[PDB]
């Protein structure tokens, strides 16, 4: 009967109370000792629930929805269980008053339809603001990079970091594929972003300035190593190998070793450019840039290995001419070059730019973003209380308890961080209802603040998928009046 539901509520609370301190990056961790005697410690709730393997069906239901939250999304594994468990506590006193469990399940479903509608409204999507793929992400890195020595030049630096991930496919983002090399000399704000692959000048031999740097219709050719007059494992044999480059009409030759002076003289009259001593990581990125392939010898070169970009030019950046690839929209990876008066100064700025790239990387994958830090969580609970006037009747008190159940997420975040959950909830609602609704809770020092001002954002699909998973799993537990466990 109805008594079995009460037993299932305490089963979800017992699992919740263990996962309450685990909410948040600074929250507590659970130490589980398996019967195998191997002891592991994990922050994420998935692995925590996988080691328990609870036989109870209602507690196991929270484990299944937690594994799907960590698989298809990867974030919100702990929050989906706390929200689903706390929702069970609000429905506990309703059964004692005679309210059937059916309208309790259907009452929460009506609140979800009103909650999801407000999520898209609280989200930030700019159209008519006359922006682009950079200025939106450039501002987010500003404040994170603010209060630094480069703050004066910080406006120019945010352009090269955002355009790094925009030059390649927005569906697959990898920070390791973007190389960064330091260029000694020059002003820091005069650095330019390169769409292709760039590297330094490794030629130590005389005879430079013998080749043109501007090609109208260049061709990309990949040959591992020939490029030698004398084998480093005959003059006519090398001339026949260099003739294959002339037969295919390729003005670009790249290798991982140095190039002898014989190739530079033969490539002068044919306007063919060649660069030796190229790093192994650079050769793989050039192949992915033009979408070609490398051939071992010069005889087996196939015609489809050739490729062309918009324009090639050799810039004077750093009082030295460096190779770079510009105007390649098909390049799967870019390369960044920084300028500065010293190599140690660039290294300190280079490491600071990696943090700004990782922030805008997760924002590009998911274009639906809502304001975090209790902002969205407080607005959803407030709107359900105002719209409940037409929900009046037994369905009103059900949704009113759902709005209070949404306050458990910011609670544990403040309790695990040391803040007082009693005072922070009273001062937040006053600043949220009066004036602007964007005022959140600061995670560092307890005070009222705007998360939209601090540019700390959270993806909305984490909360949307967790809200439907917490409600769907709740309707399954509230609908079970009897549980029979067979032995075997």
């Amino acid at each position: 009967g109805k008594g079995q539901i009460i037993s299932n509520i305490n089963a979800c609370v017992a699992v919740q109370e263990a996962l309450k301190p685990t909410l948040g990056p600074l929250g507590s961790d659970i130490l589980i000792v398996t019967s195998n005697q191997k002891t592991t410690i994990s922050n994420d709730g998935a692995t925590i629930l996988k080691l328990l393997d609870v036989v109870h069906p209602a507690a196991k239901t929270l484990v299944d929805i937690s594994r799907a939250q960590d698989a298809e999304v990867g974030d919100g594994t702990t929050s989906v269980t706390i929200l689903a468990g706390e929702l069970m506590k609000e429905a506990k006193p309703f059964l004692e008053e005679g309210i059937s469990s059916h309208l309790i399940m259907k009452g929460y479903r009506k609140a979800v339809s009103l909650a999801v509608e407000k999520i898209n409204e609280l989200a930030v999507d700019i159209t008519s603001e006359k922006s682009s793929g950079r200025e939106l992400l450039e501002r987010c890195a500003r404040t994170a990079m603010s209060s630094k020595l480069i703050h004066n030049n910080a406006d120019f630096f945010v352009k090269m970091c955002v355009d790094a991930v925009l030059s390649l496919d927005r569906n697959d983002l990898d920070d390791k594929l973007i190389g960064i090399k330091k260029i000694p000399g020059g002003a820091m704000e005069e650095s330019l972003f390169i769409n292709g692959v760039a590297f330094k000048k490794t030629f130590s031999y005389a005879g430079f300035e013998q080749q043109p740097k501007k090609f109208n219709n260049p061709k990309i050719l990949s040959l591992n190593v020939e490029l030698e007059l004398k084998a480093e494992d005959e003059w006519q044999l090398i001339f026949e190998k260099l003739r294959q480059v002339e037969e295919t009409g390729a003005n670009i030759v790249l290798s991982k070793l140095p190039i002898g002076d014989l190739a530079t003289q033969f490539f002068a009259d044919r306007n063919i450019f060649c660069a030796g001593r190229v790093s192994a990581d650079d050769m793989n990125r050039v192949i992915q840039a033009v979408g070609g392939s490398i051939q071992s010898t010069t005889s087996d070169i196939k015609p489809e290995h050739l490729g062309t970009c918009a324009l090639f030019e050799e810039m004077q950046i750093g009082s030295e001419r460096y190779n770079l690839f510009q105007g390649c929209p098909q390049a799967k990876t870019c390369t960044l070059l920084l300028r500065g008066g010293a190599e140690q100064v660039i290294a300190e700025v280079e490491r600071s730019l990696h943090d700004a790239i990782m922030i805008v990387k997760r924002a590009l994958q998911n274009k639906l973003i809502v304001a975090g830090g209790g902002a969205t969580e407080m607005e959803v609970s407030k709107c359900l209380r105002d719209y409940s006037k037409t929900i009046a009747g037994k369905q009103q008190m059900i949704i009113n308890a759902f709005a209070k159940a949404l306050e458990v997420i910011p609670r544990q975040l403040c309790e695990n961080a040391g803040f007082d959950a009693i005072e922070i909830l009273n001062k937040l609602r006053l600043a949220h209802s009066k004036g602007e609704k964007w005022y959140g809770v600061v995670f560092e020092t307890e005070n009222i603040g705007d998360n939209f001002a601090k540019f700390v954002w959270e993806p909305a699909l984490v909360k949307i998928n967790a809200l439907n998973s917490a409600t769907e799993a709740t309707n399954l537990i509230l609908s079970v009046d009897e549980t029979i466990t067979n032995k075997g």
Binding site: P21, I30, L31, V33, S35, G418
Partner: protein, 502 residues
Amino acid sequence: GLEAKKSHILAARSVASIIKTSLGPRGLDKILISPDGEITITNDGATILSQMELDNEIAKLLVQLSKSQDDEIGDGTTGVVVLASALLDQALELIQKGIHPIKIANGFDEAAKLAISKLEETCDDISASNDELFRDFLLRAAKTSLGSKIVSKDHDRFAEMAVEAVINVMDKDRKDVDFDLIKMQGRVGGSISDSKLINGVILDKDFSHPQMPKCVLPKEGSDGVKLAILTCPFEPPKPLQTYEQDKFKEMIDDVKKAGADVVICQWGFDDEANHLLLQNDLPAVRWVGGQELEHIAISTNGRIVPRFQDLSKDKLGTCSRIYEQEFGTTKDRMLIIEQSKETKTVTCFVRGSNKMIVDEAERALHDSLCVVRNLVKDSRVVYGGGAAEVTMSLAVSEEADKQRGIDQYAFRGFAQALDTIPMTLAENSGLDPIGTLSTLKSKQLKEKISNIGVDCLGYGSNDMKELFVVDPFIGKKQQILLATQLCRMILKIDNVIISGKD
């Protein structure tokens, strides 16, 4: 959330209370019994904590940290556990007052960083004082750990062995001493005065057939001594005496062309294999472990030869000579492989008249080699023995009134927790812990700021600066960081979950 905070403090206190009496040179020993029936007695906390097998979730963190302390430092075994329990006892009083546990964790982290900057001003330099005074610290480094044992009579001999061994295996660039590059080997029997320092791997061998010479000839002024490293066994080709003998003549040509004096293999040899190697003056070496082959190529600057066809003269290990030297009255008659050039690895040779003396000397030498690494890595050092903890206490307590807020009480509890070590050393020395603690604080304020510690072993007087008792600063700095790192992980886990035994 209710009984967890109270149980975690009492569980870690009872386990840490075991080694509180063993801290210091006067710390009392204990009787440990292995599951095989062997009785061992030692004062080292690493041996006592490692042998503990328990299901308590809180006490398992002491074993996980103690494994990393032996490699990094090795002296932070007993000291850190007692210091970590002091932070937990002071945190228990704060939990009852309503202090948040993470604030206690973050309060000890900020208090530890402030105490490091205070000792940076009062520390002194070694090499700036003199060059030979640095070596005097290395000679007396092992004397402190060996002063409580019978080894303290011959201690002057073991002091010079650790000085020349670290210089070869450690370069002043990285200033790192790898434990894998130091081979610790010892046997029962003999005495402790016959211990010698070897610049390379020992690799004891009986030289197979007795007709083989016990020494390696230079072979007409040849360069060094070439040795062959084989990772494959020596057998005739298979998917009769003259058939296998003719096949052995083809494989031995790779040794003659490369010019290897001694042949080393991982597997045993046949009887006819030693017959051809005897007339060619090629001593055979069989039954060599896999890990022993790594020490051969590092000391002799050799390479690993996977197969017989890959054997070359450039991959042969080069040494000075290989001879068999009798050690004491032992009938094993081990051998010595020397170098005469600086290698990247050494092997420690320690002997003793008792099985316990050998094990106690190897572990004491391990901690002695780590102190030399910290003295070279950091020239600035401080005077320990109770003087460092009192200095850190007065520094944090003075800055506690200057920092307002909740952290004001976090600094007071952190300063009182630092007083546990000098009081424990005072208790372990048989003196009043409170009466002695007030004496050390009075001499460092009204008179002048200096380092005066508690004497565990009977000495002439106080002020160890006169007796030249030095401790590494980075060694003591690593201890206070692991103590705060361990104290947080205990507070960061409020949950206890364990299953049954089927």
